[PDB]
Each structure stands twice: as structure tokens, then as C-alpha cells.
Amino acid sequence: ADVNPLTLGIETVGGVMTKLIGRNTVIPTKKSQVFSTAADSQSAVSIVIYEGERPMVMDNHKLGNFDVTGIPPAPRGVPQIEVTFEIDVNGILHVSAEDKGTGNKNKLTITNDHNRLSPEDIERMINDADKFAADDQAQKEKVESRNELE
Numbered sequence: 001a002d003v004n005p006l007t008l009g010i011e012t013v014g015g016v017m018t019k020l021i022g023r024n025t026v027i028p029t030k031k032s033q034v035f036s037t038a039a040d041s042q043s044a045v046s047i048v049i050y051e052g053e054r055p056m057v058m059d060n061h062k063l064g065n066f067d068v069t070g071i072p073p074a075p076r077g078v079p080q081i082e083v084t085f086e087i088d089v090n091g092i093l094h095v096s097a098e099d100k101g102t103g104n105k106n107k108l109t110i111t112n113d114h115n116r117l118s119p120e121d122i123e124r125m126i127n128d129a130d131k132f133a134a135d136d137q138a139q140k141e142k143v144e145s146r147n148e149l150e
Contacts, residue, residue: 002027005122008085008093011048011057013038013148020085023053023126030086034100036077038148044069045081045149047097049110051117053129055140061117061125063110068097070104077148 003026009019012035020031037045044067052060071079080100087093096107117125129136 002091004029004087006051006061006125007053008049008051008087010035010083010149011046011050012145013150014143015057016143016145017050017052017055017057017060018145018147020083021087025087027087027091028089030084032082032084033147035081035083035147035149037071037074037079037081038076038150040075041073042076042079042150043071043073045071045079045097047083047095047106047108047149049095049108052125053136054132055136055143059128061121063093064095064108066095066097066106066108068099068104068106070102071099072102077146081149 003024004021007019007023008021009017012018046065046067048065049063050057050060051063054060081097082100083097085095093110098105
């Protein structure tokens with residue numbers, strides 16, 4: 001089966017890995033979730049894209065990042081920013097985000113061409129998540145995983 005070998009997601013407040021496409025999803029696929037701002041009066045959010053199986057992004061591999069800006073000032077949790085991950089028929093990942101309130105949007109295509117992990121890196125990273133299952137399953141249950149972005 002042709003699938004993404006690692007979970008794909010974004011960093012949420014506290015450096016938390018928030019999955020959009022879990023590992024072993026059949027390709028092609030498209031998945032969206034809505035996020036909000038992590039602080040009052042926040043005029044932009046950063047979409048920071050990671051691959052890997054760990055609960056904290058410091059232990060996963062960053063693939064890219066971009067911002068959505070021009071968010072009218074509002075309290076924490078009010079803006080609604082829809083984030084889309086799409087792996088196309090060619091296996092290429094495209095991430096986009098849009099502030100539902102303003103229509104302001106941005107996007108980034110993650111090519112398979114540059115600064116990618118090897119098969120052996122990918123193997124090790126999966127093995128790592130079984131190895132630290134108890135540390136991870138615990139810490140995943142500790143952190144506050146609200147879909148809010150810095």
C-alpha cells in the first residue's frame with residue numbers, strides 16, 4: 001500500500017506535535033483542521049510543518065513553515081484558521097492555511113527533493129516511537145493540546 005511513512009502535522013502552542021495526517025494513511029489524501037491564536041491580540045500565526053511520531057516537535061523533523069498575517073485583533077481562541085494538508089497523486093505534500101474571517105491565505109509545497117530524511121532515518125524515527133511509547137503516551141496525556149498557534 002502506498003502511504004505516508006510518518007505522521008504529518010503542525011506545531012501547536014507549547015511546542016506540541018498536532019497531527020493532521022496520521023502515519024500509514026493511503027495516498028492521495030486531504031485533511032483539514034481549524035486552529036486559532038495562542039495569545040490575545042495576535043495578528044499572525046505560524047504554520048510550522050513537522051513529520052514524525054513523537055509528541056513534542058523538538059523530537060520530530062521540520063519540513064517547512066509559513067505565516068498567515070493580517071488577523072484582526074481578537075482574544076485568544078477567537079480567530080478561525082483552517083489548515084489543510086494534501087498529499088497529491090504524485091506523493092507530494094501541499095500545506096495551506098486560511099483565516100476563515102478575512103480570506104487571508106498562504107501555502108507551501110514540500111517537495112521530495114531537498115533536505116529530506118533517508119529511509120534509514122525514517123525507520124529509526126518509527127522505531128523511536130515504540131521505544132519511548134511509555135514516555136510519549138504519558139507526555140501526550142500531560143500536555144495541553146488545544147489547537148492554538150503562536
